[PDB]
Automatic annotation (TrEMBL), chain D:
Belongs to the UQCRQ/QCR8 family. Component of the ubiquinol-cytochrome c oxidoreductase (cytochrome b-c1 complex, complex III, CIII), a multisubunit enzyme composed of 11 subunits. The complex is composed of 3 respiratory subunits cytochrome b, cytochrome c1 and Rieske protein UQCRFS1, 2 core protein subunits UQCRC1/QCR1 and UQCRC2/QCR2, and 6 low-molecular weight protein subunits UQCRH/QCR6, UQCRB/QCR7, UQCRQ/QCR8, UQCR10/QCR9, UQCR11/QCR10 and subunit 9, the cleavage product of Rieske protein UQCRFS1. It is a single-pass membrane protein. Its main location: mitochondrion. One of its GO terms (cellular component) is mitochondrial inner membrane. This is Cytochrome b-c1 complex subunit 8. It holds the Pfam family UcrQ.
UniProtKB/TrEMBL annotation, chain E:
It is a peripheral membrane protein. This is Cytochrome b-c1 complex subunit 6. Residues 4-67 form the Ubiquinol-cytochrome C reductase hinge domain. Keywords: Acetylation, Disulfide bond, Electron transport, Membrane, Mitochondrion, Mitochondrion inner membrane, Respiratory chain, Transit peptide, Transport. It is found in: Mitochondrion inner membrane. Belongs to the UQCRH/QCR6 family. The lineage of its organism: Eukaryota, Metazoa, Chordata, Craniata, Vertebrata. It comes from the Eukaryota. One of its GO terms (cellular component) is respiratory chain complex. One of its GO terms (biological process) is mitochondrial electron transport, ubiquinol to cytochrome c. Disulfide bonds join C13-C57, C29-C43.
UniProtKB/TrEMBL annotation, chain F:
Component of the ubiquinol-cytochrome c oxidoreductase (cytochrome b-c1 complex, complex III, CIII), a multisubunit enzyme composed of 11 subunits. The complex is composed of 3 respiratory subunits cytochrome b, cytochrome c1 and Rieske protein UQCRFS1, 2 core protein subunits UQCRC1/QCR1 and UQCRC2/QCR2, and 6 low-molecular weight protein subunits UQCRH/QCR6, UQCRB/QCR7, UQCRQ/QCR8, UQCR10/QCR9, UQCR11/QCR10 and subunit 9, the cleavage product of Rieske protein UQCRFS1. The keyword Mitochondrion applies. One of its GO terms (biological process) is mitochondrial electron transport, ubiquinol to cytochrome c. Gene3D superfamilies: Cytochrome b-c1 complex subunit 9. This is Complex III subunit 9. One of its GO terms (cellular component) is respiratory chain complex III. Its main location: mitochondrion. Keywords: Electron transport, Membrane, Mitochondrion, Mitochondrion inner membrane, Respiratory chain, Transmembrane, Transmembrane helix, Transport. Transmembrane segments: none annotated. The keyword Transport applies. It holds the Pfam family UCR_UQCRX_QCR9. Belongs to the UQCR10/QCR9 family.
From TrEMBL, chain J:
This is Cytochrome c. Component of the ubiquinol-cytochrome c oxidoreductase (cytochrome b-c1 complex, complex III, CIII), a multisubunit enzyme composed of 11 subunits. The complex is composed of 3 respiratory subunits cytochrome b, cytochrome c1 and Rieske protein UQCRFS1, 2 core protein subunits UQCRC1/QCR1 and UQCRC2/QCR2, and 6 low-molecular weight protein subunits UQCRH/QCR6, UQCRB/QCR7, UQCRQ/QCR8, UQCR10/QCR9, UQCR11/QCR10 and subunit 9, the cleavage product of Rieske protein UQCRFS1. It is found in: Mitochondrion inner membrane. Coiled coil: none annotated. Belongs to the cytochrome c family.
Length: 49, 49, 379, 78, 67, 59, 241, 49, 55, 48
């Protein structure tokens, strides 16, 4: 019983279903001239293309 | 972006240097700037995720 | 029992700790910080509740609810200054309290000392989670740097961090849980303070001469109740002067800017009371090495009682140790300073020096000199 | 509850006066200040030194940092 | 017409020894940097030394003449 | 004999000492606020809306 | 590389510990904001009501607010509509979102000015020096197109074109609208916007200081009074012998 | 000092400036037939016209 | 005063949250007082007669 | 939420793409439409 209850409570502090729901993002390589570095927010952290 | 003694990136927190490929060259930073899993299948587009 | 002050189960307690309590007749001003710390605690809690009643823990409303507090709530701005600066007052007092302890060998009261260290760690966690709440640039990035320290721990590191965050980075679930923690910890501090004082009363206070005071004790009241109220108002002037005439003297202007996940401030520097520890963290260029160095920088305190070699308790009659003591204090001053500078020559070297000498003084010089001093007394 | 079982003391007499029969802050110049000086004096060379040392290190490191921000004319002579 | 006291005062302070010396070093830098076609040098430092000296001076008088 | 009179009438009985502290605080407050408020406004003549107001008042 | 020019310290009439803000200068500063800066800069945390009893009368304030159109609704059809401003309304945003803002400023984002003097090292001193400090780049330095040279801005290439110049507006109070006079006033206004409690904070500090001096003394005596008993206490060791 | 501090703290729990900011609402009497009762939220409570 | 406005609203909600967070701890503290007074005499028992002869 | 309960992940993705959702602002500070994602919630029939 203890192992289960503690396990449940513990995991209630890890990523919730809405957060784990993760998608992709498309970026047109047209807004990026040769030599440049554009940053796009994504899955929290910055996405460097 | 576009900083550091390797023409890549420079982290202003503790001075970690990265080359234009995103690899760690100088500083405290353990590994290289993570390369997200992406595919190019998409004309002038890039589906990352 | 003829008088209630002694028979009643509740008054009995107030009487045995604040009225009839036997206290050394010769304790100085360095013995005032204990009660001041207690008052900071009660003060912080009181103002904290007042602020909590207008705060909103959501990354989209945090920053503005604090603005709403300072701009619309009657005396909201006042209450916020008092809380924000009160935290500094708290650390000023805890550092002096600790210094007193080290100098006068109060640490020989092991349980009181050890719980004392727990109190410091707890107060620090409180400040950290509390500082995140307004959600400014400094709040966000500092929280980022700190929480990422834990990822240094091998194997479980990355796992613990993401767990702590409730996601893949400092975000809203991190904010709401930090608010809860900030609301809760002050009370753990209050609880543990009772344990602190409970261990202390087993022996009563130490005194500046380090020799038994059983031959000269005096009732806490009115001697120290008055002396302590005096100490309060003396330290209250700088507090209020700072709070009312220089509200932002000690704060980073960067925290007046909403947190931006995409832009990291040029110079990320912690609050003054964590500077020295930051400097130590950076001294070791290795990620995990720095964490250990930092851990040790505070956990070293648990070791102090076992490095006492002197045959005397205090440093009052130990001129060599006294010099060594002030070097340490100055060493901490340098670390504080180094901690506010960028990682660049000459700072980097000065930093490693001060870090290195910090651990050297405590781990080697103090016990060594203590032994050397015993011999010069022909012991 | 400790008063009464603290220590074994013999042959000591002490004398005290009511607070209303005496001055709160007596002999400021003949006793107080002379002692403040005594105390100050006896500690200045124990305390001051290390702080002086830190102060210097500070000054140096600060000046040295700003000095390395300046241009070295010898980098553009030719 | 209309004259901004900041202009007046700036011209006055530029007569100052500190400013004059700084101004002098600036022109020397400008001159040589402008004359070369392959140098990394820049006169930011001399410019700052100048602006810094001039402006510190300005600060003392400027508000006396403002409303 | 103010100290003497004060002692007998106000400071002797613990009850009277309390009433003295209340009226004292009352009188002190009124006087201290007005005085402090003056000292402040005097050190800032012509800068407060109190000073400027008349120019745009037109109710 | 990290070369930076630090602004000098100007003697603002509100710099002293008991020095209030010059409300005439703050009223003027408001005009500068309203007629110049507000075209690109938002001030999300200030409402027209905040002006009342500070720089404007209630009537003036109401008028100022009615000059603006604000969005409200939905109405009975679930439609959003426009309406004249109310003193309870906050200052209008020049753009719907930062994206739009940058889009109208060469990708540069004009920051909200509600707390700008507290969000920048130097405060008004820095804001003043920046506004009145544009000039041509020194030899060897080339500002990219769209940016302007300003030695006071970090990096020295700012994306904001000089916002003010002589007579760019006319103070309805008659004050000579010179560039520096303007910078001075708006900066004063900015100090106010950032900390509306500025004055009251200082009036309290005054009392705090007086009461503290008094109380600290009275308590010092009482501590000394009680402790006199021990301080003058004498003792002697008279063993039987 | 106590009277003031307590007074300040106490009043920090009463209506804040933004809340006290109170306006009026206009209602066209040509949207309510003869006998009808329309409700409009207002100053928190319901406004009956 | 309690409402922080003219009716139950947001300022009522945020202050209620704070109170709800706090009170449980006042309950815990007062429980200690409860038990402290109790131990002065120890428990009563179903017969209402002294149990000193059988504890 | 449908996945593993009533539909397969593929079916769920399809269901979501049948809807147009508002997103943005874009580079001009403009709001635009896009096909749905499984992370999207069911569409409201009315704005308010
Ligand atoms: C930790 C983070 C560090 C942050 C910066 C630290 C702050 C630095 C400000 C300096 C503080 C002022 C101290 C000056 C006091 C000078 C003085 O009076 O010293 C001499 C005097 C002589 O006393 P006696 O030997 O009993 O002789 C009396 C008659 N027989 O010594 C004392 O007062 C006792 C020493 C207690 C002061 C300790 C305060 C130091 C505070 C900093 C933190 C240090 C500890 C951390 C250890 C790990
Ligand atoms: C307008 C304002 C209205 C004010 C309303 C409040 C009314 C309060 C009146 C209560 C009655 C007070 C009388 C107390 C009587 C008890 C007594 O003996 O005096 C106090 C007694 C003195 O003993 P004796 O000298 O031996 O006197 C014997 C005379 N026969 O004890 C004392 O010294 C206590 C007085 C010192 C106060 C210490 C406070 C200093 C601290 C400063 C911080 C500032 C305050 C901020 C408060 C924040 C709270 C959230
Ligand atoms: C045409 C739009 C425009 C006007 C009008 C304007 N600004 Fe700005 N302002 C900007 C932009 C764009 C920036 C961004 C600069 C950058 O980050 O490169 C800026 C930035 C600033 C900054 C400082 C940014 C920093 O990082 O230090 C301040 C302060 C400021 N403006 C003040 C003013 C004030 C006060 C006025 C009116 C006297 C004013 N501005 C008028 C466009 C404008
Ligand atoms: C919230 C934190 C703390 C509070 C409220 C607190 C409170 C107190 C109080 C009331 C006293 C008695 C009066 C005095 O001597 O100052 C005391 C004594 C003491 N405390 Fe603390 N303390 C705190 C933190 C610490 C820390 C960080 C340490 C050490 C690492 C510590 C070590 C001690 C010791 C050893 C004494 C003995 C004093 C003597 O030599 O007689 N305390 N503390
Ligand atoms: C040991 C006691 C405490 C310490 C050291 C402390 C410290 C802090 C710090 C460092 C801040 C940030 C101030 C800033 O904005 O710059 C903060 C924020 C805050 N604290 Fe505390 N706090 C304490 C107790 C409490 C308690 C008990 C509560 C409430 C029940 C609380 C509620 C708040 C709130 C609501 C904020 C956010 C609003 C703000 O930042 O002004 N705090 N606290
Ligand atoms: C959070 C609420 C409370 C807690 C945690 C609590 C806890 C306790 C505990 C642990 C005991 C000893 C075991 C027992 O006899 O049940 C006790 C006894 C007692 N409590 Fe409470 N109590 C609570 C509320 C109350 C209330 C509401 C009353 C009465 C209005 C009450 C009256 C008593 C009394 C009179 C006893 C004596 C039992 C005897 O006859 O020996 N308690 N309580
Ligand atoms: C929530 S960020 C934070 N919390 C403080 C108050 C803290 C940190 C650690 C322990 C106690 C208190 C602090 O100084 N920072 N800032 C900061 C800035 C840069 C790097 C690290 C921390
Ligand atoms: C008296 C207390 C009894 C507690 C025992 C209840 C244990 C329930 O255990 C739970 O069962 C679920 C059903 O599959 C699992 O999904 C959970 O992971 C598991 O923790
Ligand atoms: C009222 C102020 C309390 C401060 C905390 C001091 C601790 O703890 C101790 O427990 C004993 C047994 O219950 C009591 O008799 C003592 O008086 C009490 O000090
Ligand atoms: C029914 C009683 C109503 C009294 C209204 C109290 C208004 C408080 O007025 C206060 O006066 C202070 C001194 O001038 C100012 O510094 C404060 O900013 C102001 O809010
Ligand atoms: C020991 C510190 C004592 C501080 C007591 C000072 C009391 C603060 O005084 C305050 O001044 C403000 C400005 O006029 C008023 O608006 C407040 O109502 C008043 O309480
Ligand atoms: C573990 C919690 C036990 C309840 C607290 C009782 C403490 C009062 O108990 C008294 O000391 C006897």
């Amino acid at each position: 019983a203890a192992k289960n209850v503690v396990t449940q409570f513990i995991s209630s502090l890890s990523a919730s279903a809405d957060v784990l729901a993760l998608s992709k993002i498309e970026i047109k390589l047209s807004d990026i001239p040769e030599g440049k570095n554009v940053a796009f927010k994504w899955r929290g952290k910055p996405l460097f293309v | 972006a576009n900083s550091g003694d390797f023409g890549g990136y420079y982290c202003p927190c503790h001075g970690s240097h990265y080359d234009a490929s995103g690899r760690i060259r100088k500083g405290p930073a353990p590994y290289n700037l993570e390369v997200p899993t992406y595919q190019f299948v998409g004309d002038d587009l890039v589906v990352v995720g | 029992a003829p008088n209630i002050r002694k028979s009643h189960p509740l008054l009995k307690m107030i009487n045995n700790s604040l009225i009839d309590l036997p206290a050394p007749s010769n304790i100085s001003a360095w013995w005032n910080f204990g009660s001041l710390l207690a008052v900071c605690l009660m003060t912080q809690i009181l103002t904290g509740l007042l602020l909590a009643m207008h705060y909103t823990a959501d990354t989209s409303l945090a920053f503005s609810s604090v603005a709403h507090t300072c701009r619309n709530v009657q005396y909201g701005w006042l209450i916020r200054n008092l809380h924000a600066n009160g935290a500094s007052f708290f650390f000023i007092c805890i550092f002096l309290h600790i210094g007193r302890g080290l100098y006068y060998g109060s640490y020989l009261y092991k349980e009181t000392w050890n719980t004392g260290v727990i109190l410091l760690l707890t107060l620090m966690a409180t400040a950290f989670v509390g500082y995140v709440l307004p959600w400014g640039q400094m709040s966000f990035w500092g929280a980022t740097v700190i929480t990422n320290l834990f990822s240094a721990i091998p194997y479980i590191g990355h796992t613990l961090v993401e767990w702590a965050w409730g996601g893949f980075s400092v975000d809203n679930p991190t904010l709401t849980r930090f608010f809860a923690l900030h609301f809760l910890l002050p009370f753990a501090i209050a609880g543990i303070t009772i344990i602190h004082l409970t261990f202390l009363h087993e022996s009563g206070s130490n005194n500046p001469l380090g020799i038994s005071s059983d031959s000269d004790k005096i009732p806490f009241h009115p001697y120290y109740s008055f002396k302590d109220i005096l100490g309060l108002t003396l330290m209250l002037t700088p507090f209020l002067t700072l709070a009312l005439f220089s509200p932002n003297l000690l704060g980073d202007p960067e925290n007046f800017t909403p947190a931006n996940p995409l832009v990291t401030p040029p110079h990320i520097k912690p609050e003054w009371y964590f500077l020295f520890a930051y400097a130590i963290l950076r001294s070791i260029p290795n990620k995990l090495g720095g964490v250990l160095a930092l851990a040790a920088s505070v956990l070293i305190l648990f070791l102090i009682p076992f490095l006492h070699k002197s045959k005397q308790r205090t440093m009052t009659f130990r001129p060599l140790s006294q010099t060594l003591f002030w070097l340490l204090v100055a060493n901490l001053l340098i670390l504080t300073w180094i901690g506010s500078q960028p990682v660049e020559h000459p700072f980097i070297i000065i930093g490693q020096m001060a870090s290195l000498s910090y651990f050297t003084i405590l781990l080697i010089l103090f016990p060594t000199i203590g032994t050397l001093e015993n011999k010069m007394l022909n012991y | 509850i400790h008063f009464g079982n603290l220590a074994r003391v013999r042959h000591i007499i002490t004398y005290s006066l009511s607070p209303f029969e005496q001055r709160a802050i007596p002999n400021i110049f003949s006793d107080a200040l002379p002692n403040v000086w005594r105390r100050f004096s006896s500690q200045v060379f124990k305390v001051a030194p290390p702080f002086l040392g830190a102060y210097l290190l500070y000054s140096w490191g600060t000046q040295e940092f700003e000095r390395l921000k300046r241009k070295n004319p010898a980098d553009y002579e030719n | 017409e209309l004259v901004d006291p900041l202009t007046t005062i700036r011209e006055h302070c530029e007569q100052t020894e500190k400013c004059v010396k700084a101004r002098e070093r600036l022109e020397l830098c400008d001159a040589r940097v402008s004359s070369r076609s392959h140098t990394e040098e820049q006169c930011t430092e001399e410019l700052f030394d100048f602006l810094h000296a001039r402006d510190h001076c300005v600060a003392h008088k400027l508000f006396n003449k403002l409303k | 004999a103010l100290l003497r009179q004060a002692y007998s009438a106000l400071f002797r009985r613990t009850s009277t000492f309390a009433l003295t502290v209340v009226l004292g605080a009352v009188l002190f407050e009124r006087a201290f606020d007005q005085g402090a408020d003056a000292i402040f406004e005097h050190l800032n003549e012509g800068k407060l809306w109190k000073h400027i107001k008349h120019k745009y008042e037109a109710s | 590389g990290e070369l930076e020019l630090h602004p000098p310290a100007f003697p603002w009439s509100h710099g002293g510990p008991l020095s209030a803000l010059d409300h005439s200068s703050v009223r003027r500063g408001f005009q500068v904001y309203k007629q110049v800066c507000s075209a690109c800069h938002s001030m999300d945390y200030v409402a027209f009501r905040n002006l009342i009893g500070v720089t404007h009368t209630e009537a003036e304030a109401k008028a100022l607010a009615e000059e603006v159109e604000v969005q409200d609704g939905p109405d009975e059809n679930g439609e959003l509509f426009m309406r004249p401003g109310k003193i309870s309304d906050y200052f209008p945003k020049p753009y719907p979102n930062p994206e739009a803002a940058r889009a109208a400023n060469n990708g540069a984002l004009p920051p909200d000015l509600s707390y700008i003097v507290n969000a920048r090292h130097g405060g008004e001193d820095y804001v003043f020096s920046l506004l009145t400090g544009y000039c041509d780049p020194p030899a060897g330095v080339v500002v990219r197109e769209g940016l302007h040279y300003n030695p006071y801005f970090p990096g020295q290439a700012i994306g904001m074109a000089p916002p003010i110049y002589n007579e760019i507006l006319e103070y309805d109070d008659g004050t000579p609208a010179t560039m520096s006079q303007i910078a001075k006033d708006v900066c004063t206004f900015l100090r106010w916007a950032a900390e509306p409690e500025h004055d009251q904070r200082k009036r309290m500090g005054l009392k705090m200081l007086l009461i503290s001096a008094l109380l600290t003394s009275l308590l010092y005596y009482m501590k000394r009074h009680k402790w006199s008993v021990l301080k003058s206490r004498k003792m002697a060791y008279r063993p039987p012998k």
